[PDB]
């Protein structure tokens, strides 16, 4: 599956980021993300913020309940188990699940901007950027060491190709 994000910084349009999901390696993790992009469950990522952007590290988002890192939920109810760890954080431009330790996957995710081998076996990798890596770069340059954002960066519209 390929899904997309239309990103905006303080009401202003930046561009569309397109992702391919590893639906034949991590089918349940890729499905959570796909369904949250389309909003077909009546809830999902449209309108949700990138609440934590660390330059030369990653972009963290997906909290569509509270917007600050404390919320969000998966399509299976609450949190779900780590599906597997077959893919590694070996290149920039990967989608990987945020969590609160083992088997606590919900809706939060991050996008890497550098190889992160120290996250292998801790975070489930389920996709990569196939188009718009330059909008990831623009968003990244809006962050800070602390993760605080210089602008309100929102996933204004999301969907599936």
UniProtKB/Swiss-Prot annotation:
InterPro entries: Cyclophilin-like_dom_sf, Cyclophilin-type_PPIase, Cyclophilin-type_PPIase_CS, Cyclophilin-type_PPIase_dom. Pfam families: Pro_isomerase (PF00160). It catalyses: [protein]-peptidylproline (omega=180) = [protein]-peptidylproline (omega=0). The modification Phosphothreonine is found at residue 70. Transmembrane segments: none annotated. It comes from the Eukaryota. One of its GO terms (molecular function) is mRNA binding. GO terms for biological process: ascospore formation; cellular response to starvation; DNA damage response; negative regulation of meiotic nuclear division; positive regulation of meiotic nuclear division; protein folding; protein transport. GO terms for cellular component: cytoplasm; mitochondrial intermembrane space; mitochondrion; nucleus; Set3 complex. It is found in: Cytoplasm; Nucleus; Mitochondrion intermembrane space. The modification Phosphoserine is found at residues 141, 144. It is an enzyme of class 5 (isomerase). Signal peptide: none annotated. There is a cross-link at residues 28, 41, 122, 138, 150, 157 (Glycyl lysine isopeptide (Lys-Gly) (interchain with G-Cter in ubiquitin)). The modification N-acetylserine is found at residue 1. Keywords: Acetylation, Cytoplasm, Isomerase, Isopeptide bond, Mitochondrion, Nucleus, Phosphoprotein, Protein transport, Rotamase, Transport, Ubl conjugation. Binds cyclosporin A (CsA). CsA mediates some of its effects via an inhibitory action on PPIase. Residues 4-160 form the PPIase cyclophilin-type domain. Its EC number is 5.2.1.8. Interacts with a complex composed of SIN3 and RPD3. Identified in the Set3C complex with HOS2, HST1, SNT1, SIF2, HOS4/YIL112W and SET3. Present with 86000 molecules/cell in log phase SD medium. Belongs to the cyclophilin-type PPIase family. PPIase A subfamily. PPIases accelerate the folding of proteins. It catalyzes the cis-trans isomerization of proline imidic peptide bonds in oligopeptides. Involved in histone deacetylase complexes, suggesting a function in chromatin. Imports fructose-1,6-bisphosphatase (FBPase) into the intermediate vacuole import and degradation (Vid) vesicles. Regulates the meiotic gene program via the Set3C histone deacetylase complex to promote efficient sporulation, and the prolyl-isomerase activity is required for this function. This is Peptidyl-prolyl cis-trans isomerase. The lineage of its organism: Eukaryota, Fungi, Dikarya, Ascomycota, Saccharomycotina.
